[PDB]
């Protein structure tokens, strides 16, 4: 048998005087799926049902299982288990987030911030909600690629040392890329008002180009590039192009 050993952060808020721990669990790799999630499940089901984590989609699309494996923030469900058994693989929750139990962090500041950007299409001319399609060219919509893929997993926000130290004022890479996904949407009018909401010295500008976000994102996306883009926009070094005009026959 090939026995992999995991070091898995524990915390029980129920118990009095309780302090975080690290617990070793041995997993027979031959009786277990390829992915780190698989091990956690195996361990929960066969060894310790009190082991507590988030999951849904088994394919890397929900973002619920985001955690810190092997030092980096990734999704457990598409992280291959490290086959070499002389290593112990370490599993902590998303760094610098308040925890509830084990690998489940309080995710609500994250969410509130994503509400703050107003993640929905705005138009300065009231539209008849069902009636016809907004024009947008291919080129225009292709600006949304690498931006709309974000699954809200928080891996990157929780890898940003600035968002560690100032989660309360600096929005962080996840929420900021999404703020930018609605800014450069040609179908959206309110670019100016969106930028007004993060003018101050913390909201956007506490990005100190550390780059751990674009690195760690398990979806192969780039927030540091999007933020950079916001800085240019926020300092008038650039502007949003106006929407390509909606052709007569449409």
């Amino acid at each position: 048998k090939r026995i992999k050993t995991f070091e898995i952060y524990r915390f029980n808020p129920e118990e009095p005087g309780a302090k975080p721990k690290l617990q070793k669990f041995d997993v027979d790799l031959d009786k277990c799926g390829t992915m780190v999630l698989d091990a956690l499940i195996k361990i929960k089901n066969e060894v310790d049902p009190t082991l507590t984590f988030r999951r849904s989609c088994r394919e890397g699309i929900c973002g619920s299982c985001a955690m810190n494996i092997a030092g980096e923030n990734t999704l457990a469900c598409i992280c291959n288990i490290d086959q070499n058994t002389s290593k112990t693989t370490k599993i902590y929750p998303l760094p610098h987030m308040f925890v509830i139990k084990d690998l489940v962090p309080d995710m609500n500041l994250f969410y509130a911030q994503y509400a703050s950007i107003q993640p929905w299409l705005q138009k300065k001319t009231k539209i008849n909600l069902g009636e016809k399609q907004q024009y947008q060219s291919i080129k225009e919509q292709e600006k949304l690629d690498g931006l709309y893929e974000c699954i809200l997993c928080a891996c990157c926000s929780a890898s940003c040392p600035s968002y560690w130290w100032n989660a309360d004022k600096y929005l962080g890479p996840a929420v900021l890329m999404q703020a930018y996904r609605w800014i450069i949407d040609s179908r959206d009018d309110s670019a100016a008002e969106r930028l007004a909401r993060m003018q101050d010295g913390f909201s956007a500008f506490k990005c100190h180009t550390i780059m751990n976000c674009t690195k760690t994102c398990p979806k192969h996306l780039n927030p540091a590039r999007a933020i950079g883009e916001i800085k240019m926009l926020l300092t008038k070094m650039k502007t949003k192009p106006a929407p390509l005009p909606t052709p007569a026959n449409f």
């Binding site: 509400a115 703050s116 007004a196 500008f205 100190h208 926020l234």
Partner: protein, 129 residues
């Protein structure tokens, strides 16, 4: 058993309700831009001072480095002078201390260029060793 107490709504940011009555404008934008333009300008200066020395370069190094390091430490200070970890008065004392650090820095350099060898010369004298 179900003998119970009326609940309340869970805390939750209402982005529209928050929007009513907050308009405020303080663009850090134009301030950020110049901090960078200034660092870009210092790129020539740093080697300019490798080659050309004197009491006049000592002065421009002393002025650029005072102003750049002012904005430097200020940041570092806002990044770690956090009220959650320090509580406001003590953390506003770190904010203020970023300015004392700027003013002592200059004072010290000016002195050093006026009643001592100067920056460029001081560098020469360690490189001669």
């Amino acid at each position: 058993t179900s003998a119970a107490v009326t609940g309340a709504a869970p805390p939750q940011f209402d982005p529209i309700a928050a929007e009513k009555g907050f308009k405020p404008l303080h663009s850090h934008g134009t301030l950020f831009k110049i901090e960078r333009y200034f660092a870009a300008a210092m790129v020539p200066l740093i080697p300019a001072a490798y080659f050309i020395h004197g009491r006049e370069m000592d002065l421009c190094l002393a002025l650029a480095l005072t102003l750049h390091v002012h904005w430097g430490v200020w940041g570092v200070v806002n990044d770690y002078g956090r009220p959650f970890v320090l509580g406001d008065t003590l953390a506003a004392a770190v904010r203020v201390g970023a300015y004392i650090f700027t003013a002592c820095l200059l004072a010290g350099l000016l002195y050093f260029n006026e009643h001592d060898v100067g920056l460029t010369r001081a560098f020469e004298m360690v490189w001669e060793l």
